[PDB]
Design a protein around this ligand. Sequence first.
Ligand SMILES: [Cl-]
Ligand SMILES: [Cl-]
Ligand SMILES: [Cl-]
Ligand SMILES: [Cl-]
Ligand SMILES: [Fe+3]
Ligand SMILES: [Mg+2]
Ligand SMILES: [Mg+2]
Lengths: 212, 192
Amino acid sequence: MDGVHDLAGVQGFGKVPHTVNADIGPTFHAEWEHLPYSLMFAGVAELGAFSVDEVKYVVERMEPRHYMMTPYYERYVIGVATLMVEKGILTQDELESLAGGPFPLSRPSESEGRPAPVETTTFEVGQRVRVRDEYVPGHIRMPAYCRGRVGTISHRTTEKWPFPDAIGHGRNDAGEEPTYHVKFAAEELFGSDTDGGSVVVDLFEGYLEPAA
Amino acid sequence: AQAPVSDRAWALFRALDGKGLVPDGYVEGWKKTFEEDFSPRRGAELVARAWTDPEFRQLLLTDGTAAVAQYGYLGPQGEYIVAVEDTPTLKNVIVCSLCSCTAWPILGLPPTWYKSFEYRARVVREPRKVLSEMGTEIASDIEIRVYDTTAETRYMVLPQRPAGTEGWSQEQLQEIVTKDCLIGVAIPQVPT
Ligand SMILES: [Cl-]
Ligand SMILES: [Cl-]
Ligand SMILES: [Cl-]
Ligand SMILES: [Cl-]
Ligand SMILES: [Fe+3]
Ligand SMILES: [Mg+2]
Ligand SMILES: [Mg+2]
């Protein structure tokens, strides 16, 4: 999904709000902040109501202005709440009744997702690959800065995982794929407009193809 | 228009808890895990071991998962580990441009700044400037390599061991390997 969450390479942001080794305070800065993750885990591990991938996607589905003005942990309160409503476990009415006011949720999905591709390639360390020049309106674990770009395999994972584009919509056809650490030169991704060396992106097999 | 976030968060809890969907002690357990167990002190232990034990260093860099599992530090959002080695010509730095992905059990939960739009947008494109702004000058003769945590691999940086620490104990070395060193934005510092 080409959402506002796909931030890498966006220009116009200011200073990162940290100097090295500065005190970051306690893990949680408010008494509610442990709830989103704890309740995500109740959903995923205790109830089996949704996957972690579905949490990533439902946050991506926040209305864009809403995403941009919402602090991190609050996004996950909104996301987990959304998924519990979509899955029929909770209603928006009961959340607003208990909250004492408005509890706007993430927007509905505009895509049904896609299956894990049946046609893929097992790549080896050192091989040159291109990131498939595809547009996926639902969930995908490919940041747009690498779409269509060529890099080299640094690592093939020794485990396999469900294809996010499927399991992030709760589909039954996510399969399993290894991922690849793909090293791109900074200039391949941003031309002359970068100060870096290389960027390594961890990409699912199904996002890759051999380089020309 | 929105109700206070505290009210929304506790409404979500109460809604689920009142349906019997949240086990007794469940969120409080996770809070304890998040606050007390998941910690960059674990990553610092791993780094100090690698610095003092060439055999373990080799293991950590070839099969990070196995190395971490020896200490019992595998966990949620930290099941498949890769450690990435700084060298005299290479500085590694970790981000999750899409959200916040972090090796929780060994780095701790990510700090506010790592989840910031500023870090997520900028470090992939201008890592040298971002590190500089943060207080870390990377010599012009060093490649920066940004790892974007886009799948299930969870990373930790193995920083270079600084001079002036020869012969230190593992406990001593642990002390100078900070969270920011593990993420890759800081270089371990030796007092005088
Ligand atoms: Cl609170
Ligand atoms: Cl292919
Ligand atoms: Cl912070
Ligand atoms: Cl620290
Ligand atoms: Fe993330
Ligand atoms: Mg753009
Ligand atoms: Mg030495």
